[PDB]
Amino acid sequence: SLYEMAVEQFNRAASLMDLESDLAEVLRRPKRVLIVEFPVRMDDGHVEVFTGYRVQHNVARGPAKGGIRYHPDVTLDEVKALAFWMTWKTAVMNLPFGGGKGGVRVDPKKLSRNELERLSRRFFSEIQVIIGPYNDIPAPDVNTNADVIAWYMDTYSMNVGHTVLGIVTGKPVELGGSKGREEATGRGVKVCAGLAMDVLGIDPKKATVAVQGFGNVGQFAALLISQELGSKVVAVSDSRGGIYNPEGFDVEELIRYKKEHGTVVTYPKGERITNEELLELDVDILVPAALEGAIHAGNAERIKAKAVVEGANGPTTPEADEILSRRGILVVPDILANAGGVTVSYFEWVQDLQSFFWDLDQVRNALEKMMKGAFNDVMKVKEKYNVDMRTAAYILAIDRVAYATKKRG
Amino acid sequence: SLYEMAVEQFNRAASLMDLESDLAEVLRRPKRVLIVEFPVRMDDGHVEVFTGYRVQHNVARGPAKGGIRYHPDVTLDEVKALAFWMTWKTAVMNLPFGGGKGGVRVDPKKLSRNELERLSRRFFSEIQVIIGPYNDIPAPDVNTNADVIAWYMDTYSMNVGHTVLGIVTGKPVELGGSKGREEATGRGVKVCAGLAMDVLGIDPKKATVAVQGFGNVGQFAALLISQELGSKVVAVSDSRGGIYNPEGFDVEELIRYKKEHGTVVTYPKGERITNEELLELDVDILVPAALEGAIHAGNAERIKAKAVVEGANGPTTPEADEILSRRGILVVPDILANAGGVTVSYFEWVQDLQSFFWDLDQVRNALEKMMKGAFNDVMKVKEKYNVDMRTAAYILAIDRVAYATKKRG
Amino acid sequence: SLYEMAVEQFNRAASLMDLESDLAEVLRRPKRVLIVEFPVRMDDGHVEVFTGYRVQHNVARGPAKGGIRYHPDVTLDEVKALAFWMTWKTAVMNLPFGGGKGGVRVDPKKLSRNELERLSRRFFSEIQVIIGPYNDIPAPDVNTNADVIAWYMDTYSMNVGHTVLGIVTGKPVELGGSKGREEATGRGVKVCAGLAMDVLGIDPKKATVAVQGFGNVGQFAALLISQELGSKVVAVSDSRGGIYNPEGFDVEELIRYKKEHGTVVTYPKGERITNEELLELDVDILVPAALEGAIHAGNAERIKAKAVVEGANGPTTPEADEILSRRGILVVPDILANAGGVTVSYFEWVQDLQSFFWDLDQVRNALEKMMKGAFNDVMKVKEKYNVDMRTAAYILAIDRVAYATKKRG
Amino acid sequence: SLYEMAVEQFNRAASLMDLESDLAEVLRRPKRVLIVEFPVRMDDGHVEVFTGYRVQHNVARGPAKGGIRYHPDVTLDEVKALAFWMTWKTAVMNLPFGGGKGGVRVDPKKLSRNELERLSRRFFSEIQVIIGPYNDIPAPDVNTNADVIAWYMDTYSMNVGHTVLGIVTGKPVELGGSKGREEATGRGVKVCAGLAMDVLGIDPKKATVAVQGFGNVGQFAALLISQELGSKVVAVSDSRGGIYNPEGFDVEELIRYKKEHGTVVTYPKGERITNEELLELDVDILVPAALEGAIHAGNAERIKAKAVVEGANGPTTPEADEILSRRGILVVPDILANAGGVTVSYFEWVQDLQSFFWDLDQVRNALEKMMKGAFNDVMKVKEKYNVDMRTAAYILAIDRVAYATKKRG
Amino acid sequence: SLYEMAVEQFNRAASLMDLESDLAEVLRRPKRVLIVEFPVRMDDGHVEVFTGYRVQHNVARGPAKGGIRYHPDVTLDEVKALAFWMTWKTAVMNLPFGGGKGGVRVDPKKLSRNELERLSRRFFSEIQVIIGPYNDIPAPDVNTNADVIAWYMDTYSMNVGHTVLGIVTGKPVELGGSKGREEATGRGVKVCAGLAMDVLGIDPKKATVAVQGFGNVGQFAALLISQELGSKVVAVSDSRGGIYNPEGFDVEELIRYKKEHGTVVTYPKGERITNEELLELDVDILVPAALEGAIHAGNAERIKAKAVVEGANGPTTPEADEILSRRGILVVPDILANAGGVTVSYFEWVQDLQSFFWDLDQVRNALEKMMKGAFNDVMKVKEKYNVDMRTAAYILAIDRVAYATKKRG
Known part of the structure; x- marks a missing residue:
């Protein structure tokens, strides 16, 4: 699978260096994987459940960092792999971050501004349990932009009880x-x-x-x-x-x-x-x-x-x-x-x-x-x-x- | 799958009563599913990673209730199904609880008392993010007893910063x-x-x-x-x-x-x-x-x-x-x-x-x-x-x- | 004013007993008065701001207790007076509560179920800063019932991050x-x-x-x-x-x-x-x-x-x-x-x-x-x-x- | 010393039963001992520092329980011994409590009501870091009564941000x-x-x-x-x-x-x-x-x-x-x-x-x-x-x- | 009234730009207005209640910012107006702040250093529920200086349980x-x-x-x-x-x-x-x-x-x-x-x-x-x-x- 492919590449470099076998295992496997099934009230009054994910691969070096995707074709496997990559991507740049990724299986083009907003808010309210400025900082990715990210920031702040704005990156400049x-x-x-x-x-x-x-x-x-x-x-x-x-x-x-x-x-x-x-x-x-x-x-x-x-x-x-x-x-x-x-x-x-x-x-x-x-x-x-x-x-x-x-x- | 089979039985009764379609969906799908890969230091100094899960199907009626399993053959699907059942089991008895279940893919017979304890502590420390006396209250099940539950209670109390003892049930009488x-x-x-x-x-x-x-x-x-x-x-x-x-x-x-x-x-x-x-x-x-x-x-x-x-x-x-x-x-x-x-x-x-x-x-x-x-x-x-x-x-x-x-x- | 009239009655009894003058003053004046102007999105997409109040007269004996009113003719003065009464009402019954009251200037009959819900949630989200199961416990009153109270209970619980259900009274029996x-x-x-x-x-x-x-x-x-x-x-x-x-x-x-x-x-x-x-x-x-x-x-x-x-x-x-x-x-x-x-x-x-x-x-x-x-x-x-x-x-x-x-x- | 004498009595009973040596040591030694030097503003505008203690011997069975003393002749040793006793006293009665004790080296008879109140408040504000309804619950003892205990309860509640009243026992009935x-x-x-x-x-x-x-x-x-x-x-x-x-x-x-x-x-x-x-x-x-x-x-x-x-x-x-x-x-x-x-x-x-x-x-x-x-x-x-x-x-x-x-x- | 006059000026500019009517309303009305009646023990042992206010007009751009006034002639209206201004003042400067203001109806010249300090502490203890380094940051104004501000900072830090110093501005340089x-x-x-x-x-x-x-x-x-x-x-x-x-x-x-x-x-x-x-x-x-x-x-x-x-x-x-x-x-x-x-x-x-x-x-x-x-x-x-x-x-x-x-x- 896509994840396994990523792991394979890791194994190569892992073999070039004398990395302790028992340790390598913890580096391959992701720390947390949260799968949420959340209801969203559609404009026509009917509720519709969406599937969302958030994976924190490694937090060793610091708070998990990774974007969130809105796409109808999004498998947990894809998320795990991308999160896996983030860990190494942040590490190579020498940034105090970990590896994370998230996504909701939804086609934004079939949703109206309002429905999208509500979905984004309910999503961030669901994975809130695991995120945080010092835990997991999401960011934009496929089909998510500053506007969506702004909703996130707002939803977190309003939920926690104070302006946070460090909960997500890729926010509008004037915000x-x-x-x-x-x-x-x-x-x-x-x-x-x-x-x-x-x-x-x-x-x-x-x-x-x-x-x-x-x-x-x-x-x-x-x-x-x-x-x-x-x-x-x-x-x-x-x-x-x-x-x-x-x-x-x-x-x-x-x-x-x-x-x-x-x-x-x-x-x-x-x-x-x-x-x-x-x-x-x-x-x-x-x-x-x-x-x-x-x-x-x-x-x-x-x-x-x-x-x-x-x-x-x-x-x-x-x-x-x-x-x-x-x-x-x-x-x-x-x-x-x-x-x-x-x-x-x-x-x-x-x-x-x-x-x-x-x-x-x-x-x-x-x-x-x-x-x-x-x-x-x-x-x-x-x-x-x-x-x-x-x-x-x-x-x-x-x-x-x-x-x-x-x-x- | 085992979960889908459980769902099927649900659908039967769901058809007998005029349950709103859109609503039924939220009742089928579980609220949260947490998958954790946690390292545990074995007696012989080598680290070994185990896979653990905790699923909260529905919290509508109250805090999620459900046991934890220690078994080499435990699939997420099995957990989801059992959690699904818990929701209906608590509801039928009219208890202010939701539905939850958890488990760690491990054969306790291959682990020594110490290793078991450490595994239990690390596990509860991992799912702690989602549990709580007013959120999710675990309990014993297959291969887990009062002793294991006691470690859980102890680990939570020591982590939080005060005696809780309501974080898990099935604890020793004199505890x-x-x-x-x-x-x-x-x-x-x-x-x-x-x-x-x-x-x-x-x-x-x-x-x-x-x-x-x-x-x-x-x-x-x-x-x-x-x-x-x-x-x-x-x-x-x-x-x-x-x-x-x-x-x-x-x-x-x-x-x-x-x-x-x-x-x-x-x-x-x-x-x-x-x-x-x-x-x-x-x-x-x-x-x-x-x-x-x-x-x-x-x-x-x-x-x-x-x-x-x-x-x-x-x-x-x-x-x-x-x-x-x-x-x-x-x-x-x-x-x-x-x-x-x-x-x-x-x-x-x-x-x-x-x-x-x-x-x-x-x-x-x-x-x-x-x-x-x-x-x-x-x-x-x-x-x-x-x-x-x-x-x-x-x-x-x-x-x-x-x-x-x-x-x- | 209505408040002043209530105070007048207080003064009578206060004179019958040797109540310390300086002390009497603290008993007359309310501890807190929170006035909020909150937006609510109406079904026709237009935002409309409503005025809401929450007053905690006295908390000396325990957490402030008092209902919430939904009425177009609701002056802060009316609330203050009602809160003033609550203090003495709870005290006479010998209950461990204080005095509180709240209300939103709105005519429920002009609002649709959805609009009412949203208004109720945003209101409770606004006065949340001051309420709490050990601070202030609202309850139903004019134009508010178990259904509205249920929304409150749900709003608080989802906001705080766990089932509370003690934040408000007068909730449905099976809730x-x-x-x-x-x-x-x-x-x-x-x-x-x-x-x-x-x-x-x-x-x-x-x-x-x-x-x-x-x-x-x-x-x-x-x-x-x-x-x-x-x-x-x-x-x-x-x-x-x-x-x-x-x-x-x-x-x-x-x-x-x-x-x-x-x-x-x-x-x-x-x-x-x-x-x-x-x-x-x-x-x-x-x-x-x-x-x-x-x-x-x-x-x-x-x-x-x-x-x-x-x-x-x-x-x-x-x-x-x-x-x-x-x-x-x-x-x-x-x-x-x-x-x-x-x-x-x-x-x-x-x-x-x-x-x-x-x-x-x-x-x-x-x-x-x-x-x-x-x-x-x-x-x-x-x-x-x-x-x-x-x-x-x-x-x-x-x-x-x-x-x-x-x-x- | 007084403590050592108490320990001596423990050793007797400890020898009668096959108690693991390594374990006995943890039972003898107290978990925490907090010593505080706090300023108190005297009526004549001059600051005076007092010495206060709070010892939590054992919390194994539950939150530490123990009174507080106001006496000019109070040595840490006395406190430790008394705390040691509390642990066995609660245990014998089969109460879900631990062992605790505290005291302030001061002669209440030389202090005026006001000075006493301020001292009591500052003291409780100092040991607050360690106390709590689920951690350590003080109570009255030598030269401390319901009135002093009431100040404690009040100080805690006002500090934490809500009525607690479970922080101390021996409070006035109507409180x-x-x-x-x-x-x-x-x-x-x-x-x-x-x-x-x-x-x-x-x-x-x-x-x-x-x-x-x-x-x-x-x-x-x-x-x-x-x-x-x-x-x-x-x-x-x-x-x-x-x-x-x-x-x-x-x-x-x-x-x-x-x-x-x-x-x-x-x-x-x-x-x-x-x-x-x-x-x-x-x-x-x-x-x-x-x-x-x-x-x-x-x-x-x-x-x-x-x-x-x-x-x-x-x-x-x-x-x-x-x-x-x-x-x-x-x-x-x-x-x-x-x-x-x-x-x-x-x-x-x-x-x-x-x-x-x-x-x-x-x-x-x-x-x-x-x-x-x-x-x-x-x-x-x-x-x-x-x-x-x-x-x-x-x-x-x-x-x-x-x-x-x-x-x- | 003074507030209404401020609002009128707002309306002018609001008309020059195509600002959505429904939105304009939220910008006019203040988010929170807290009125507190707090007792203060005067030097001569008699208690005296004072009236204090704290208004947070808008927090959209960030934590509310605004000074506190000590003046015998201070109406809620004056506060609201000043708070209203703060929102536009911070915004024009492009600072990540909102609009706030506060005051206590008292003539400092009739109060002694001690009484003033006590009043300041009790006041900040009262509006504490609404303030915070990421919520509302007070500052000096009429009849309030670095000294009073220092008391605030100290009161907050001591209440919260750790040095904050970001709760108020205008503090002494060496503090x-x-x-x-x-x-x-x-x-x-x-x-x-x-x-x-x-x-x-x-x-x-x-x-x-x-x-x-x-x-x-x-x-x-x-x-x-x-x-x-x-x-x-x-x-x-x-x-x-x-x-x-x-x-x-x-x-x-x-x-x-x-x-x-x-x-x-x-x-x-x-x-x-x-x-x-x-x-x-x-x-x-x-x-x-x-x-x-x-x-x-x-x-x-x-x-x-x-x-x-x-x-x-x-x-x-x-x-x-x-x-x-x-x-x-x-x-x-x-x-x-x-x-x-x-x-x-x-x-x-x-x-x-x-x-x-x-x-x-x-x-x-x-x-x-x-x-x-x-x-x-x-x-x-x-x-x-x-x-x-x-x-x-x-x-x-x-x-x-x-x-x-x-x-x-």
Whole structure:
């Protein structure tokens, strides 16, 4: 199952390091799993029961951190796996958080604003027993945004008996949120992209970048890499097709174009190329910020990119990993690359605790500071074990979590 | 699955009464299900993780009530089902409790006293988040006794910061328990047996009773029916065979015999007969207090008993039910018959809350009082819907639970 | 103002006893007054703000006790006065409670079930900050019933995080309520009536009783006096007219008659008389259980009743008091007479605390026991001060409250 | 030291029974000892610091119970010893309490009402951290009465944020107290005296009783023994001398005499004798309810009393014990005899928890019921070990506490 | 009434923006209003009851913030109004606070230090139920200072059971306070004055300033504007008269002069002019930091000042507003101008939460940073709606509060 698959990856890195067998078991199994069946009064007066989950995998390093999903196709297994990942994701970034995830099996598109609100409130009222600013801090994810998160924050505060606002992250700025939240993920990819160029000895000013996908990650990535690093973004791709141009695109125009025209396709001064073609472009850095399995067995052999900065989750398949590593192509692991999102949520949580908020610049500096740190920390482990950067990242994560559990008892 | 089967029985009674569809759903689905993976340090210094569960099906009528199981073969489904039953069991007896159950996948026989204690403490520390004297009150069950329950009580009290003793029932008498705990179940069977004789116009003094099984329920039932009702206990059976004697057995001698000789078999002045044979005895009342499916398809047609007082859980299969009812043979539902145990746990909880303890007599009177009440209440519904007493019991339970939910909102 | 008038009556009794001036002030002024403006979402999606109040006059003797009102014409002043009364009402009965009252300025008839529920929940969520089973225990009153009270109970429990059910009284029987709740007030009147007869040397068997009004109070009062005391109920009056018959009415028939016919008027075998005429009936006991100022200046001089058992609030005007007392006509004060309602709410609270519920008989015995006690206690004070029984009741109440404050500090 | 001496007595009984060495140590040593130095603002504006203590010896069986002392000569050692005693005293009576004691080094006679109140409030505010209705329930003792106890109750309630009244016992009746409080101790002595006569085959009607001391214990004991048992109280003694008369005194007149005349000395129809002489009177039962060491080495040999019911603490010295036992003179241990006070405080605590109060008769019945029980329970142990009743009482107490600890873990 | 007048001003801005009617109502009405009548023991042993209030207008944006008043003439209405203002004042500054205010009807000058302390403690003990570091944080105001505030902080901490120090602001520096507290208000005026010059294109070095009033606000404002901005302070006025000098006054000497001489009047090198005359001075900036209605109808037409920076509350009457705006004279609204005080209290609360305190410089930088921000924010709205800056400030405030409520639900 999806969870078992995640565990399998853990086992690999676990074998590379002398981790006590008995201890490993506690690291695999999740601490808590709460399943709730809650009634919600529909607009037409009829009650309808929904199924929701909240899983806290590990709390050793600190309060469980993880988003909540609203999707009709959500299995407990999916939740467990995602929570499992969170533990390692927070650990690698060196954040004082644990691993958590939650979700309600519901199709938000079939529910009206009111029904959605009531569902969200009843849900948060149900898992409240297990959450808390110092226990479990939820956040947005698939089909959940600042608005839903705001309801959560409000429901908790009203239930507890005082303004909390540290119970969830990803809240509206003018209600406890943090600046830089949107660009967060992209900036992470930007930092990693830069450092990737550094170890490869590539001069950013001359560096060529190709980004697969143009969502939040893809856009901000391509934008910041361009403006801040000076790399020439030669190609981007929408969920329909991509555009190429060795002269370099003006990311700003591309974003505006996509906003005014569903896709970046048809954009003037851009040779149309298919997404599969983009991955094989002769560029220095390839930033796959679109779908899973993008870089797979067939592509692997033909990828001319010197470094792969995984902007999205699982763009490169394990099969591809072996080949890319074999070819000497550096693949910066997603858990490190896109971690920028979590890094900022942490900053939000901090600001909330002390009710004092930092300005954009501060957030950016702190975000990049930790990114460079985590990157270097992973590289150290990489050299020490002589493995793929991804595996190294997992080893570091597993190591840190193990230490805390050992020291604690 | 086992849970789905329980649900199915619920649906039957739910159809007999005009229960709102939307509402029925909330009654089917359990409120909370907590799954925990907790480490326990084994005597040989190695840590071992165990899987534990605690399910609160419905809290509408009051704090969730339900025992905890220690067994290697325990699936969440089993727990859910048993919790589901608890809700209806408490409701039928008219106790201010909800439905709950819990268990840890572990074979106690492979663990030493110390390891067991540590496991019990860690378990209760894990589910503590959800339990409470006014939320969920656990109790003993398979492979858990007063000693284990005592550790629970102690662990909670020490964790919370003050003596609680109302967090769990079935504790040692000289530590918060209640008198009559042991005979509780049997006395219930005794009351029901008497009332059954009343509705059947059978004079107890002439009444003949046959009890299958000689565990806690079997012994106390057979003894109390004999002593208090005067009915002639003509046959009892051990998990090896049974003994018959129309002259009647001196239950006291039988109990002593079993205590000094593993089985009641071989007992002098007792014609040896098989368990299956005992069920087919020409007796007024048959009290099956042994295993499930005792009374099944094959037996059904050949049961000469005028009434069946289910001392155990599910002795009569649904197939047998149809036949027995068709033949006009009265079958007192287990949820009512053996509920005596829960009824007394309630009394314990009460005594604990006010820290004043009642003497044996009081407990007995209160236990019988509520038993006669619940019996009659079930009978009323039976006549009103003209169905099998079991079905009636379920209707009553479902009705009460629905009322509370409606009135509450 | 209404409050000031209540205070004035207090001052009278306060002057009769050497009550420390500085202390008297604290007894006059209420401890807390909470005014809330809360939004409620109406069915048509529009929000509407309502004004609600909760006043705890005195908590010296115990947690504040008092009902909640839903009425468009409700001034803070009305609440303050009512709360002021509660203090002395509970004290005279010798109950461990204080004085409280609350209300929301709203016309329930213009609101739909749903809107009412939401309003009730948000109201209880607002005054929650000040209430509590050991702080302030609300109860039903004008336009609020067991159903509304149930919502309160549910709202508190879900807010706090566990079943409370002791946060409010007057809840449905199968949800924490107490038996005898309905007849409570009437039974109080019954006990008072009997004792009034006893002091007057009147034999109840020959005693003639007239009841002005046929509401909850009047009905049960009349019925119980009839069946239990044996007094001939010669007349009763609906809110339209009254019926008289020296032979004595069969109260049961009268009740059923009213249930099938909006008024007791037109009832066969009953000489029609006006309400004003009933008060002037040549009867031993007059039980005014209808409206305020019933017995006023004009009536006073012409009342042939030997004793007046005030079943309702303020039936006799102060002017009438002076005259009645001057004429030697005993007037059992309402705070003592109709206190039966409060006395039972106390018993409900008790049962709730220990989650064990008493049966009807117990409640009745306990209610009458305390009534006889309170009556005699007032009589002792009456004789000691040689004043009107009403004044005596006030002195006793003020005395008890003062003692607690003094001893506490 | 005083503590060590107490421990020494424990060791005796501990040796008689096979008590695990390692366990015994936990039973000797006190769980908590809190020493506080708190400022108190004196009337003349100057601050003065006082030293206060609160010791919780053992909480195994339940919340620590024990009085508080106000005395200039109070050493921590004294407190520890007294606390140690409480544990065995509650245990022998079979009460769900632990052992506690406290005190403030201050001479109340040098403090004004106001200063005393402030001191009491500050003290209770200081030890609050450790006390609680389910943790530690203080009570009155030397130089502390219902009035001081009331301040405590008030201070706790106001501090916590709600009426508690279960935080301390010995409160005013009209403020949470219980009836029978005063006579409690005496009644205990009465029951014990009766049972003593029963074991000695002495007919109470003919039994002669001599009481050394005429304080609360002496007066009530003598009174009840006379009225309820019918035994002839032939002598009583004040703290100045005693009076003798074989005809039997009219205790009531004696009480009134003392209230009107400081001592019972000079009372007509009473042959004046010295306290030492009274102890040597040829009476069936000697009830020493005065000072410590009354019955010592010199007296021992010359005591003609058939049984000694220790109304006070330590009247008979250990030396005297050996001799009395050797002579076959039964000595009912004080921990059992005067335990009546504690037994009633328990009842008070109970009533407080459920806010429902019992009437005098109920308290009396419950008090005597438990006394007879405790007596018989001690007797059983006495016969089983063939030791002095005092030692037996200690064994029983030690046993019960040991069981709780073992079962708990 | 005063409240209604405040509401009227709200309505104006509310009409300029499309604010939902139903929503507007919730913004007008206050959430909570607590009225308490508490006893206080006077030095001469007599108890005296005082009336106190605490109103929490809106908590949508965060914990209610507002000072407490000690004044014999304090009506609930005044409190409500002031609380109403606080909501908009905090919102305009963009601080995570709500609106609150409180007061006790008492003349501190008639009370001795001791009595005052006791009153303050009992008051805070009473409103405690509603206050809290995350609920409502009081602060000093009329007749209340750091000393009184310290008592509060101490009372709360001692009551709760741990050092809080974040329960109130304006505490002594060496006890949780913040540096810059005194000059706070003045610095705000300083910043606003500077920005006013900027928008008017006036060079600060040449700028002329006249300050009506020489209290805390006037002094620091004049001094800081002089030293930090370089503006020529040509005139200042005491509560008796003013002094003028085109050469520019040495503010330091003036302050020293006033400290050694009750008024700045008589000061050498200063042409004496009346306060009314000062307002009509031909200066670039007029900073009215004295009394209300200073600039009224009569003055309006003759004011030669290019900009008015309201250092005090309501110096310019609404009538004057219309005229000044008509004449194109910029009037910086007080809610923005003197907000500096609240801005610093926020900083104090922040430091308290994390127990780490910032140095003077940091405070200053943060204070001015937020001031410039708030100013510009208001200007943006001013231009967008083309209205008086004051109205704009109100629109901004109402807008922000509206958003929070909408997003929350």
